[PDB]
From a paper:
The protein fused to a C-terminal hexa-histidine tag, was expressed in Escherichia coli SHuffle T7 cells and enriched via a two-step purification protocol combining nickel ion affinity chromatography and size exclusion chromatography (SEC). Diffraction data were collected at 2.01 Å resolution at the EMBL beamline P14 (Deutsches Elektronen-Synchrotron; DESY) under cryogenic conditions. Due to the absence of known structures suitable for molecular replacement, we employed isomorphous replacement using single-wavelength anomalous dispersion data obtained from selenomethionine incorporation. Amino acid residues 23–241 of [name] could be unambiguously assigned to the electron-density map and represent almost all the residues of the protein construct employed in this study (Note: N-terminal 22 residues comprising the signal peptide were not present in the [name] expression construct). The secondary structure elements are connected by several loops, which contain four small helices. In total, the molecule has three exposed disulfide bonds probably conserved among orthologs. Overall, this results in a compact and stable molecular fold. Despite extensive efforts with microscale thermophoresis (MST), we could not detect the specific binding of [name] to a variety of sugars such as chitobiose, chitotetraose, N-acetylglucosamine, rhamnose, cellobiose, galactose, arabinose, mannose, maltotriose, and glucose.
In this study, we biochemically characterized one such protein, [name], that is highly expressed during plant infection. We show that [name] is a secreted protein with a lectin-like fold and therefore term it [name] (lectin-like-protein 1). [name] decorated the fungal cell wall of cells grown in axenic culture or proliferating in planta, which is in agreement with its potential sugar-binding ability. CRISPR/Cas9-mediated deletion of [name] reveals that the gene is not essential for fungal virulence.
Author numbering: 23 to 241
The structure:
């Protein structure tokens, strides 16, 4: 399968994640209707070799194709009226899966091949009073809330099926954990390998910031 890498908090909980996903998954030379690569930033409560085996997961997925070619976006592409279907388009969508509550596809944002080349900004943020997670793409229509899980999110997983860069990842904890820095580990596929441009930590030890997380082919 695709490459999955994760960092894991043990006593602290993850309370916020922003991810900036580079626009590099689509192919402007492909025929209409073809798919490209995809990349996810996923939150879970327990460790899993394949994060999507988890009984409950919340993912922020970037797909290298028009949303019309992504199954489960029907009637959920909130900017469908403004983006003509075109080769080189991309799609951004939040999805929560739960073995108890079901498969809940969030709103999807279509991205034009003619739009300025810029990273896609995903955010998932806990509202502790509301006991819900704000999710989606800030300053766009593709936004919704999800109820917090019984087991709070403690693991963030980055998955990609091909070469991809997350230009920026900001993870925030409800309490400091120095071990979070070194919890980085992958389920390797001997096909892609990771490299991180830079990792920083805030003064209070709450906010970890990764710069230029790149999955690239080994051979």
């Amino acid at each position: 399968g695709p490459l999955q890498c994760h960092m894991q908090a043990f006593n602290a909980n993850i309370i916020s994640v922003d991810a900036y996903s580079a626009n590099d998954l689509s192919d402007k030379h492909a025929p209409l209707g073809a798919s490209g690569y995809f990349a996810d930033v996923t939150l879970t409560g327990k460790y899993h070799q394949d994060v999507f085996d988890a009984r409950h997961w919340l993912t922020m997925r970037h797909s290298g194709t028009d949303c019309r070619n992504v199954k489960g976006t029907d009637s959920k592409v909130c900017n469908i009226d403004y983006v003509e279907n075109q080769p080189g388009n991309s799609c951004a969508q939040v999805t929560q899966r739960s073995h108890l509550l079901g498969w809940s596809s969030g709103k999807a944002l279509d991205i034009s091949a003619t739009a300025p080349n810029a990273p896609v900004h995903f955010r998932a943020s806990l509202a502790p009073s509301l006991q819900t997670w704000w999710t989606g793409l800030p300053n766009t229509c593709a936004v919704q809330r999800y109820n917090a899980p019984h087991n709070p999110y403690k693991i963030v997983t980055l998955t990609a099926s091909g070469m991809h860069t997350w230009t920026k990842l900001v993870i925030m904890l409800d309490a400091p954990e120095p071990s979070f820095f070194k919890s980085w580990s992958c389920e390797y596929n001997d096909s892609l390998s990771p490299v991180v441009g830079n990792i920083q930590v805030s003064e209070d030890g709450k906010t970890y910031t990764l710069t230029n997380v790149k999955y690239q082919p080994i051979l």
